[model samples]
Target: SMEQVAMELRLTELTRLLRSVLDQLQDKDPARIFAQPVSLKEVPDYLDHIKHPMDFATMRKRLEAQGYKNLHEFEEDFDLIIDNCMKYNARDTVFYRAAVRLRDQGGVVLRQARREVDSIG
Candidate 1:
């Protein structure tokens, strides 16, 4: 049906937009520390301390799975990644600072994606 086709088209667009924004965030962090899940061996207490763990690779997988129903869901996962980092690491540490920067830069990227998505729908 026409409606189904349209829905699929928009979902594809949303996926594209989300991927670009994710890539932008990854690019912002030169260390690439958040590229994958936090190693349990590296920090045994990480899972215990952070209730919800998030990472760039996981987000990419979710995007591939089309787990996000809308833009808000994608943004929530993005926020979770940064918030978890900030909460687990001390404010004085580099990880905390990286989260802060990613949050700031990601906000701008998401804002841009919102504008582009307005046309998508």
Candidate 2:
């Protein structure tokens, strides 16, 4: 199907573009040694567009490739960014809330799972 193909191709194009751009910022030899700030620096700014539901096996596939342990760790690490958003711009709050909404969406599933098991026994 062209729709599925296009979707996958767009994802591929995104990855290609991102990898190309990151080459500009990665591993440059500075005049002197400097300390790094945080690992979340690897989280591409393009990530908030992605939605990783439990049903989508590849939801957090982007982060996995970037050495992020899991989606939970991804959000957990975003704490700094979210706070800084309030420190800077207006839309950053929207972004932070949206990310939280995506991560919290299926939380009720945990309760549902407990119910299903408890009734079975």
Candidate 3:
């Protein structure tokens, strides 16, 4: 039970960043890169009852410090993660749908984040 809770909590945090980062690309769905179907239709409720702040400040800082300037760049690193997850999780739709769209979304989020995150807040 503890592990399940931890897992959900951890995913909540990771999903927050993943969604935030993906937002930069507008419609980029990197989650589908490695390729696979998955599960979960409960993100809304899971997220609604979230236990963490899901703030992007800390995650953004770490990404910047590591030279992550845009989603295109971020994609490379995440591609590895996606491939790894596909090896195990497979059709994680939460991630899958988020990813496949990138095929058409382009670099909107990457492009937007630079324009927004830098001077706005």
Candidate 4:
């Protein structure tokens, strides 16, 4: 039970990191990425329209239904999502990067929030 609780906490923390990374990558503010729209909201919406654990065939079907003839068009953002999901060190990296980004972006409130979350025992 203790291990499970600890694992659950870790997952919770990891999910927080994932959400933060997603938000940062998807930021619409020009000051952040300047002329790049790296948001996942649209893709996620498309995926949600179908369901999760979509097999390769089903994914292709869904893409086809969405009029997406070329999968490569989504590859860049998908790679970002997969990289964030697969990296074991993503949470720590994201926390540090997010803190720095927030500070540089004049998001003192966000930086403080990140610090508070990271300081949790």
Compose the digit string of candidate 3's lDDT tens values, residues 1-121. 8998976665455445545764454324333332322223633443343333222233344464544533355556544433434333347565444444553354455465456444542
- Which regions of candidate 1 fall more than 4 Å away from where they truly are? none
Find the candidate with the highest lDDT and give its number.
1
Best by TM-score: 1
Sorted by TM-score, highest first, which candidate order results? 1, 3, 4, 2
**Error at 56, model 1, angstroms:** 0.4
RMSD for each of the candidates: 1.4, 16.5, 14.5, 15.2
Candidate 1, residues 13-115: lDDT per residue as tens digits? 7888788888888898889978999999988888779888888899999998877778889888888889998888899999999999988887888888888
lDDT of 2: 0.36
lDDT of 4 by residue, 1-121 (tens): 8998986666556445434533443352334321222234644553443222212233334443443222233233334333333332245565335424533553443455456556762
- Clashing pairs for predicted structure model 1, backbone only: none
lDDT of 2 by residue, 1-121 (tens): 8898976665554445434322322222121111123223664652363332221112234433653332344334333333433333354565445434433442343344335334542
| lDDT against the true structure, each candidate | 0.86, 0.36, 0.44, 0.40
The superposed Cα distance between candidate 3 and the true structure at residue 102, in angstroms, equals 4.0
